[model samples]
Target: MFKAVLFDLDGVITDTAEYHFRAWKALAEEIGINGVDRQFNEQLKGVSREDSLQKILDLADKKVSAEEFKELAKRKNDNYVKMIQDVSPADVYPGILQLLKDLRSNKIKIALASASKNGPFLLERMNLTGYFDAIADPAEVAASKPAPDIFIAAAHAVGVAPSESIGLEDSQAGIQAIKDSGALPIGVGRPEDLGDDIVIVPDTSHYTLEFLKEVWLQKQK
Candidate 1:
């Protein structure tokens, strides 16, 4: 049986991807790059800021000094923060609140594993800070997704074995991290992007407390 659940914050809990993509798109334009679309955004999901920016630069066949990339990244984040300034609890996905409540009531520890260090602020904006017992953000970890460090840290911080935990993610990289951490991986979107060993949910909107409860119960058997 799973004793804990670790959730990804952006696309899984809050619909912040659009804002992030927009910010990146604007930055790309300012930097004379092209083709920053939804598909491109998908490719960058779960990647760290520095790596993601490098990928964009590579795609655009553009080269810049490390200092320039750093400035561009900061500019993009500033725009993203502005875009999300008014985002509120109303933006949270359907069924998440009740699902969190149910998991807590059942004594299943919950934690957040996010690539973004702004996770705590975003969770607070979504009114979900109280649902997570601990959080492992990239700012506090040695590496980001696909490294398993963040998920591993989350499990350790929560005092739970990886085998006793399940991780919820919305990106292929995040799924890989969960698997690398030795936890059951639940992909919350674009199921085809995940591996066969990972469980796929249509989206957070489609997941109810009852559905998660059933899955947790079945895991026990």
Candidate 2:
């Protein structure tokens, strides 16, 4: 029943979180900071590099100028890009491709709402370039996740209202964005992180096309 399906790229579609963690860890070590872990990375997921780095600096009780932060962010991205070079179509999570195909076959517009500016490149690298009707990345939006701007922009691009859209996301920031945009939020990972406000799917592997169609698609009618 939804007119559009907006997806988060990194954790929801592709398993690029590990690469991000490695890059962030390397950068944190270079800056002599500690306590970079999976939990920390989860907190930073779906946020901009500037905000994420600033948060890290704040946590470490260190201060860096904006220019310095930009430099550090660039270095981190360089490392992340290198780390993800080996990722292929097989790296895409189970059921993701099938979901995309089902959504497309059902004539639902699909848009990507990702905080990563490199989303398009990653999609193409994973052979998923044709799966989406549009993409709203941080580079294309004024603000990042936790803000509704990206999701709103994506809906607008696909010519649909937020109420007529459903968003699939893997992070709290992303879920908040979907809620703020007035869309139905589908949490892709830990359900507790999204509370009881949105629908929670255990993981891509557990999400069946028939289930999505029956629960979400039929509801739109």
* Top candidate by TM-score: 1
lDDT of 2 by residue, 1-221 (tens): 67888888877898777888888898899889988888898778656677888878877899888788789989998989887777789889999899889888889898988767578888888898897899874555787778899899888878999888888888888889988999888788775666766677788886566776566765565
Per-prediction TM-score to the true structure, in the order listed: 0.82, 0.81
Worst 10 residues of 1 by lDDT: 190-199
Task: Give the Cα lDDT of each candidate.
Answer: 0.81, 0.82
Give the per-residue lDDT of model 1 (tens digit) for 56-153.
89887888888987898899889888877777989888778888888889888888887675788888888888888988745557877788888888
Off by over 4 Å in 2: 28-69, 137-140, 217-221
lDDT of 1 at 23: 84
Per-candidate RMSD, Å: 2.8, 3.1
Give lDDT for model 1: 0.81
